[PDB]
Amino acid sequence: MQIDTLINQLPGISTAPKHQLEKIKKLQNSIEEKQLERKSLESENEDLKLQLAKRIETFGRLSCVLFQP
Amino acid sequence: TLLRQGIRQLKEKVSKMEPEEMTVKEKKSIIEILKARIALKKAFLKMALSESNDTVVKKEDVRESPVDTFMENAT
């Protein structure tokens, strides 16, 4: 009976690999577009934020100035 | 404290050169016992000393200086 119960939910109930692979094609139509796009944000951020962090270091200079009145 | 008013108040408690003095002044000596233990009220030091405490004050007067400066850096 348990066997039948796992028969009940065979993955890919559509059972159409000819078209489920097409599903994967559309999924790549999403993912392959998203690939470098999502990672481009990394450099797009650091191009500002690294220097902004050094700005944090400059107000680190001034924090050091505040350290010793 | 109590001693402070007690100086100005023991001031004129004295009554002429006559033996009117000690008749009150022995009880005044009892008051002197009392104030002798008022000295015990101030038996230990809090903050250090003038002007070393005042040096702490002027130390704050230097310590106040950054406080009046960093706000200028608000923008």
**Are B2 and B35 in contact, with CB atoms under 8 Å apart?**
yes
Q: Nearest 5 degrees, angle CA B58-CA B39-CA B2?
A: 80
Least Cα separation, residue A43 to chain B (angstroms): 29
Q: Which two tokens stand for residue B31?
A: 């008051």
**Helices B2-11 and B20-38, axial angle in degrees (round to 10):** 170
Contact list in B for residue A67 (CB cut-off 8 A) is none
Q: Which two tokens stand for residue A68?
A: 């010793």
CA dihedral B39, B43, B47, B51 (to 10 degrees): 50
Specify the long-range contacts of residues B61-65, CB closer than 8 Å, at least 24 apart: B62/A69, B63/A69, B65/A69
Q: How far is CA A26 from CA A20, A33, B2, B11, B15, in A?
A: 10, 11, 94, 107, 116
For the four alpha carbons of B27, B28, B34 and B37, in that order, the dihedral sign comes to negative
Instruction: Name residue, tokens 């009392």.
Output: B34
SS3 of residue B16 by DSSP: coil
| Residue A59: closest C-alpha in chain B | B73
- Given in angstroms, what resolution was this structure solved at? 7.8
B2 CB-side CA count, 13 A: 11
- Taking an 8 Å cut-off on Cβ atoms, the answer to whether A69 and B63 are in contact is yes
Q: Which of B11, B1, B9 is nearest to B38 (CA)?
A: B1
How many Å is the Cα radius of gyration of chain B?
24
Phi–psi pair at B68, nearest 5 degrees: -90, 0
Q: Nearest 5 degrees, angle CA B37-CA B38-CA B43?
A: 85
How was this one solved? cryo-EM
SS3 of residue B69 by DSSP: coil
Contact list in A for residue B63 (CB cut-off 8 A) is 69
